Amino acid sequence: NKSDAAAKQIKKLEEDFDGRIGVFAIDTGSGNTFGYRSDERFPLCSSFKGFLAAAVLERVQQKKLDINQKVKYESRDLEYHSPITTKYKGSGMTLGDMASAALQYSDNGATNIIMERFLGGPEGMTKFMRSIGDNEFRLDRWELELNTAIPGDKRDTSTPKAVANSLNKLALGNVLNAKVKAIYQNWLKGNTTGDARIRASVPADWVVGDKTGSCGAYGTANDYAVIWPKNRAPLIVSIYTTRKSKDDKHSDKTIAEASRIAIQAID
Numbered sequence: 001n002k003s004d005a006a007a008k009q010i011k012k013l014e015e016d017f018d019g020r021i022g023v024f025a026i027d028t029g030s031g032n033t034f035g036y037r038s039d040e041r042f043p044l045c046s047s048f049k050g051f052l053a054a055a056v057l058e059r060v061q062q063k064k065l066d067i068n069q070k071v072k073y074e075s076r077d078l079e080y081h082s083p084i085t086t087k088y089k090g091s092g093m094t095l096g097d098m099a100s101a102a103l104q105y106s107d108n109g110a111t112n113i114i115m116e117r118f119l120g121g122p123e124g125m126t127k128f129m130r131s132i133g134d135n136e137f138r139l140d141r142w143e144l145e146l147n148t149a150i151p152g153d154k155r156d157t158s159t160p161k162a163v164a165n166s167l168n169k170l171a172l173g174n175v176l177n178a179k180v181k182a183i184y185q186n187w188l189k190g191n192t193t194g195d196a197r198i199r200a201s202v203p204a205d206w207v208v209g210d211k212t213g214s215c216g217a218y219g220t221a222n223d224y225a226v227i228w229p230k231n232r233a234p235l236i237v238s239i240y241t242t243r244k245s246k247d248d249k250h251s252d253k254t255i256a257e258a259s260r261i262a263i264q265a266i267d
């Protein structure tokens with residue numbers, strides 16, 4: 001009933017925006033879920049950076065890395081869309097800060113530096129997600145090529161379901177010990193790029209941690225979220241979208257509406 005009525009609403013919404021909308025949502029209290037195109041491939045865009053940050057945290061927990069270690073890059077020709085790393089090029093950044101900059105501002109310099117030095121490249125990123133039991137996620141390329149979002153390209157894609165599951169395991173499960181889980185959660189809560197997406201879909205008194213992506217082509221954008229309603233157990237919301245032409249812009253409102261619909265479905 002709720003599930004099928006929500007499916008129709010998403011379907012109407014995808015027609016309205018002339019693209020594809022992928023949704024998976026979990027009510028972690030009741031266990032109810034809702035999925036719309038939840039096993040179809042969508043480009044990760046910058047949304048994988050949320051998991052990159054969690055991979056760094058796991059390495060810290062395992063004492064392979066120090067969260068406070070300086071990361072220097074004074075000669076680097078910094079990638080486009082590096083709002084945070086650009087400013088600290090002079091003096092370097094702690095490993096922790098660089099990871100949270102990749103998360104909270106989608107910093108491209110932070111992302112590539114971390115992947116080249118600490119994570120084993122896209123192959124290493126993919127290995128991390130394999131290790132949490134995520135079999136759909138794949139990172140093939142580096143910044144910024146990973147963002148091309150060409151229809152049919154399976155490079156740098158996952159499914160809404162897998163993203164939902166993996167976020168649940170990482171933010172709420174026991175991949176990260178208690179202490180490092182708390183840091184991850186605080187990182188997600190202070191994300192800056194998601195004001196117009198899932199954060200716009202919920203009451204002002206709910207607490208949200210999220211991670212967005214915006215490929216900047218083929219109207220491809222996404223958001224995933226952990227949501228703490230006031231009186232209840234948390235929700236997991238995962239929204240991914242694509243569009244038909246290269247020049248088509250993404251739609252924050254469509255992502256926010258899709259979230260609204262998904263939350264209703266599981267509520």
Ligand SMILES: *[B@@]1([O])O[C]([C]C([O])=O)[C][C][C]1[N]C(=O)[C]C1=[C][C]=[C]S1
Nearest residue numbers: 045046081106193212213214215216
């Ligand atoms: B990434 O895909 O996602 C970030 C997501 C967000 O909403 O914060 C933004 C930066 C990344 N995308 C790009 O680098 C944008 C580009 C513009 C021209 C080529 S890539």
